[PDB]
């Protein structure tokens, strides 16, 4: 189920038992669905015979390599099974060890005999602002079951067990995303794509020539300047951590679902790391930082192709403008991505992105990213009010 009213056909045997609003129901209230638990299941849920829980120590390079391999071979693919996410091992450290990360929230499943990693789910702590409430939550990501273990209800036990391990730490709400419709999205956002190397994109069938266009026409149309234009643009540095935190916090106040980041969290999520996260700040003639752009690195494997093996994609992160126009800022984001060797630059239609997507020659995608809250009943919102980007 990837669209809304084909989700209406479905019954949800697992999600009907969970504290989430029903797919069809109108929500006019704001708050938890069930009470905070004052007694929590002490024992892990039972796994089918021959498998065992195992908290992964990602500080161990071999176990981290095992996690890379699990996701590299079994994680999300497109709607035609032509591309698959290729999260790098050091990207995984970035996404999975932010301030406050806990080792029991890196929840793997192993075969008892071979010790092979065949399942995974993760939680990281996050303070979330939703309408007029700030709640400490977790973000759930990287739910993955090995292809040879699918359709055996391993994913529901993974969800229940990470729920249990989060409950034990006193947290009773969570936020997550998924490309499918479930009960019940608090918001729906659409991916958009800006070709950077249109010939590679067309060759590997990521893109297609538009109506009555040719490869030569397309390459010209998508050409970009070779250097950015915005005055004072430079990579973010340690000295920028306070102003970037200040800039982000105040800009996010206009949306209805946002992170509430500490300054330590701002450092983690934005301080540039090569091939993971790029952040560029605008420092004006006064020495003041007034804007910043950021995008993270998420390549994908190209399946079944003899010469092209990988597609290097950039994902728009958080972009704050207070004196540079957002159109100009994102234009330079495209140029920096091109320079850094990306083949495509992706962005969702959330926050104010719809004001530059069409004008910068983004093409609308076939994928929706649905946003979800666990144990929090509230009215849904349009994508322009979503102010939260996950990995």
């Amino acid at each position: 189920a990837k669209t809304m009213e084909e989700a209406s056909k479905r019954s949800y045997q697992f999600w009907d038992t969970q504290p989430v609003p029903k797919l069809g129901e109108v929500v006019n209230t704001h708050g938890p669905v069930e009470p905070d638990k004052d007694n929590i299941r002490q024992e892990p849920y039972t796994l089918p015979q021959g498998f065992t829980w195992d908290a992964l120590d990602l500080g161990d390079r071999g176990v981290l390599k095992e996690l890379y391999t699990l996701l590299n071979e079994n994680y999300v693919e497109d709607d035609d099974n032509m591309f698959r996410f290729d999260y790098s091992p050091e990207f995984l450290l970035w996404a999975l060890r932010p301030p406050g990360w806990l080792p029991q929230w890196h929840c793997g499943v192993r075969v008892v005999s071979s010790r092979k990693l065949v399942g995974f789910i993760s939680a990281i702590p996050a303070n979330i602002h939703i309408y007029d409430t700030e709640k400490k939550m977790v973000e759930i990501n990287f739910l993955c079951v090995h292809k040879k273990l699918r359709s055996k209800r391993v994913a529901p036990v993974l969800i229940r067990e990470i729920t249990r391990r989060v409950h034990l730490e006193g947290i009773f709400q969570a936020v997550y995303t998924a490309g499918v419709v479930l009960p019940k999205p608090v918001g729906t956002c659409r991916y958009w794509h800006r070709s950077l190397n249109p010939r590679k994109l067309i060759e590997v069938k990521f893109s297609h020539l538009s109506r009555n266009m040719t490869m030569q026409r397309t390459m010209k149309l998508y050409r970009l300047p070779e250097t950015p234009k915005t005055a004072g643009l430079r990579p973010m540095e340690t000295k920028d951590i306070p102003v970037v935190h200040q800039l982000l916090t105040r800009y996010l106040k206009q949306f209805h679902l946002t992170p509430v980041m500490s300054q330590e969290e701002v450092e983690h999520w934005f301080y540039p790391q090569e091939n993971i996260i790029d952040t560029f700040v605008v420092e004006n003639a006064n020495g003041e930082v007034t804007d910043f752009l950021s995008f993270y690195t998420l390549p994908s494997t190209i399946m079944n192709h003899p010469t092209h093996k990988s597609l290097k994609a950039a994902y728009s992160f958080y972009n704050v403008h207070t004196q540079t126009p957002l159109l100009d800022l994102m234009s330079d984001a495209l140029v920096l991505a091109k320079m850094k060797g990306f083949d495509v630059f992706n962005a969702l239609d959330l926050m104010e992105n719809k004001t530059f997507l069409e004008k910068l020659k983004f093409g609308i995608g076939d994928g929706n990213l649905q946003y979800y809250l666990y144990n929090w009943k509230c009215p849904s919102m349009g994508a322009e009010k979503v102010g939260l980007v996950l990995q």
């Binding site: 497109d78 698959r84 739910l143 659409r190 297609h208 093409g363 995608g365 990213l369 990995q391």
Partner: peptide, 8 residues
């Protein structure tokens, strides 16, 4: 999970 999209 994040989701993989491509131009429609």
């Amino acid at each position: 999970a994040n989701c993989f999209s491509k131009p429609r």
